[PDB]
């Protein structure tokens, strides 16, 4: 089975210096990745920064997570992302995206041990 940390690494990492595609970046992200397969993902941040430099977020600044948990770290350098965001006009099957490329200090929840990533939570 998947674990959590996989499931961030499939979510979110894609260790590039930026976005590279051939066409639509979120749209063949999001497929490529299983976020269009058993609904449009809404919303969805990737991170292109190696593995570790993600994983040493969780041992940064702790912030309060948006649902209330304390398990949340925002990193001291901005990172390299791309945001996901579904269209108006986008309807399962039919997923299509709003590809916004940005360099933000990205917000996590870490979890287990090793404690890593697991959630993206939000970019500031
Ligand atoms: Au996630």
């Given at each position: 089975k998947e674990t959590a940390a996989a499931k961030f690494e499939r979510q979110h990492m894609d260790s590039s210096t930026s976005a590279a595609s051939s066409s639509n970046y979120c749209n063949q992200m999001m497929k490529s990745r299983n976020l269009t397969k058993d609904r449009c993902k809404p919303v969805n941040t990737f991170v292109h920064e190696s593995l570790?430099?993600?994983?040493?977020?969780?041992?940064?600044k702790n912030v309060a997570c948006k649902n209330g948990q304390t398990n949340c770290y925002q990193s001291y350098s901005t990172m390299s992302i791309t945001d996901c965001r579904e269209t108006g006009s986008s309807k399962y099957?039919?997923?299509?995206?709003?590809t916004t490329q940005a360099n933000?200090?990205?917000?996590?929840?870490?979890?287990?041990?090793?404690?890593?990533?697991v959630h993206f939570d939000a970019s500031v």
């Open positions: 570790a430099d993600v994983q040493a977020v969780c041992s940064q099957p039919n997923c299509a995206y709003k933000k200090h990205i917000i996590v929840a870490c979890e287990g041990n090793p404690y890593v990533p």
